[PDB]
Design a binder for this molecule. Structure first.
Ligand SMILES: N#Cc1ccc(N2C(=O)[C@@H]3[C@H](O)CCN3C2=O)c2ccccc12
Length: 248
């Protein structure tokens, strides 16, 4: 109960975008709001991550890198859950003041990615994902993308990741488990976790392209964002840093 206790305890609260729901759904205004929300979420993900059990075990530089690389996916996963819980996956609940309907999914020019995120969101329902399974999975997501040539202290990372996999196994396996149930459950969740990496890559590519042409579409990028997108995101896109997949 100690592990789960801290996961619930450190879970971020409601984060609003500050979007003007009175202005028209322009690509510019929507994306400017997603960016600002992205920044706000980054702030919370950093304080959240740093308060995770064993996170301080990681070397100093590995700490921020692991957060910056996995940030997009962490936002994807949590947002999918928010969508499931609040609107039954009908729309994408980015924030209480920024809910995407089909019109907004289209106006943002991110329809394809939105569509995939809505699918992931639906998976929480189909799979009957537990609020506890969700928390553990989100935590594991933090340690799911690293430089192909390793970190400053890979050994500490590997141990940290190993322990979080075990916690998941512990949660998704405390009841009479065996056959199509114990491993059935684990396979389902690991497959679900892998499914977030392709969404994050698509989002990374899209965000990168948008930053590059930002002054041409009147889309505003916050400081921390422009930096992460221009410094860490290209490493993922060029293959230097890659997701850790369970399958295939
Ligand atoms: N909660 C929240 C939240 C906030 C911003 C984004 N998000 C980004 O960081 C990037 C840039 O804004 C352009 C495309 N994009 C996004 O949609 C999210 C993506 C997926 C899930 C949640 C997101």
């Amino acid at each position: 109960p100690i592990f789960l206790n801290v996961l619930e305890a450190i879970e971020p609260g409601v984060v609003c975008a500050g979007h003007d729901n009175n202005q028209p759904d322009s690509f510019a205004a929507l994306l400017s709001s997603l960016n600002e929300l992205g920044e706000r979420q980054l702030v919370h993900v950093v304080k959240w991550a740093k308060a995770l059990p064993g996170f301080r075990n990681l070397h100093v530089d590995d700490q921020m890198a692991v957060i910056q690389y996995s940030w997009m996916g962490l936002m994807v996963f949590a947002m999918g859950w928010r969508s499931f819980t609040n609107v039954n996956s009908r729309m994408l609940y980015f924030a209480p003041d920024l809910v995407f309907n089909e019109y907004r999914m289209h106006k943002s020019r991110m329809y394809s990615q939105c569509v995939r995120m809505r699918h992931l969101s639906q998976e929480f329902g189909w799979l009957q994902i537990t609020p506890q399974e969700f928390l553990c999975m989100k935590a594991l997501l933090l340690f799911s993308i690293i430089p192909v040539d390793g970190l400053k202290n890979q050994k500490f990372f590997d141990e940290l990741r190993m322990n979080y996999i075990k916690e998941l196994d512990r949660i998704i396996a405390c009841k009479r488990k065996n056959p199509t149930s114990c491993s059935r459950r684990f396979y389902q969740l690991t497959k679900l976790l892998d499914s977030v990496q392709p969404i994050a890559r698509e989002l990374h590519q899209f965000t990168f392209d948008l930053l590059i042409k930002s002054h041409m579409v009147s889309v505003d990028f916050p400081e921390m964002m422009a930096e992460i997108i221009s410094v860490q995101v290209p490493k993922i896109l060029s293959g230097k840093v890659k997701p850790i997949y369970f399958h295939t």
